[PDB]
Design a protein around this ligand. Structure first.
Ligand SMILES: [Hg+2]
Ligand SMILES: [Zn+2]
Length: 255
């Protein structure tokens, strides 16, 4: 699987029949059809004790991994029940500034999308987590091209070191708090992972407010390779999945 013509998202269903399941992701957020739910609690992001370990090119994106052996960086509150621990974050981005996000807002596409992946601790590990309807929680943040994001530069500068698939680099003392918008207002809906196995275990929390990144910051993302070292160079761009049918689901807003 990939994002090319021959192995793109239109082909995933063949190896993962769940692709055309009942709660697939991403979706279009219709802000006028979204339901204001007053029962929604504010999000609680506790990332003060976060421990970053490394960054690696997995051939479809770059992942920044965190030590999740203890409740170091957790997510609670909102539509969740219990504590969810950060495991890794990654982005989805396009070839041009006009496309790149997975989720859309009233059909608008952003330049990139950031996913902070978290797993429900009653399940003891990530691996058991993906066997449950409420096993994961993904915080999604849109990126729009504007002013540079200070907090992102440490990531940008290390990309040279993990250019091709399989490469990794030690990546400690990175504070994810540098990537959050000012407001935590969000939309939520029951969905799935956006890449194979496309498991339907995710509670999606998509922030209304986008963060801005400079043209030069997004450029560096586009210089990454899908391919492995010593193989024909294929730029790592447009690693996003198109929006899926909502199919009855209801998107609720915290605002
Ligand atoms: Hg699941
Ligand atoms: Zn993602």
């Amino acid at each position: 699987w990939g994002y090319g013509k021959h192995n793109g998202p239109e082909h995933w269903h063949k190896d993962f029949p769940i692709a055309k399941g009942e709660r697939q992701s991403p979706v279009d957020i219709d802000t006028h059809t979204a339901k204001y739910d007053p029962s929604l609690k504010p999000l609680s992001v506790s990332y003060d004790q976060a421990t970053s370990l490394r960054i690696l090119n997995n051939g479809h994106a770059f992942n920044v991994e965190f030590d999740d052996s203890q409740d170091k960086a957790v997510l609670k509150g909102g539509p969740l029940d219990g504590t969810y621990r950060l495991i890794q974050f990654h982005f989805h981005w396009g070839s041009l500034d006009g496309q790149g996000s997975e989720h859309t807002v009233d059909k608008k596409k952003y330049a990139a999308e950031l996913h902070l992946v978290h797993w429900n601790t009653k399940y003891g590990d990530f691996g058991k987590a993906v066997q449950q309807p409420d096993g994961l929680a993904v915080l999604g943040i849109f990126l729009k091209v504007g002013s540079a994001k200070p907090g992102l530069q440490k990531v940008v500068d290390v990309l040279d070191s993990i250019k091709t698939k399989g490469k990794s680099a030690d990546f400690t003392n990175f504070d994810p708090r540098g990537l959050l918008p000012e407001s935590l207002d969000y939309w939520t809906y029951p969905g799935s992972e956006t890449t194979p196995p496309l498991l339907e275990c995710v509670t999606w929390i998509v922030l209304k407010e986008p963060i801005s990144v400079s043209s030069e910051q997004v450029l560096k993302f586009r210089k990454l390779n899908f391919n492995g070292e010593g193989e024909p160079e294929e730029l790592m761009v447009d690693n996003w999945r198109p929006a899926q049918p909502l199919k009855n689901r209801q998107i609720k807003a915290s605002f």
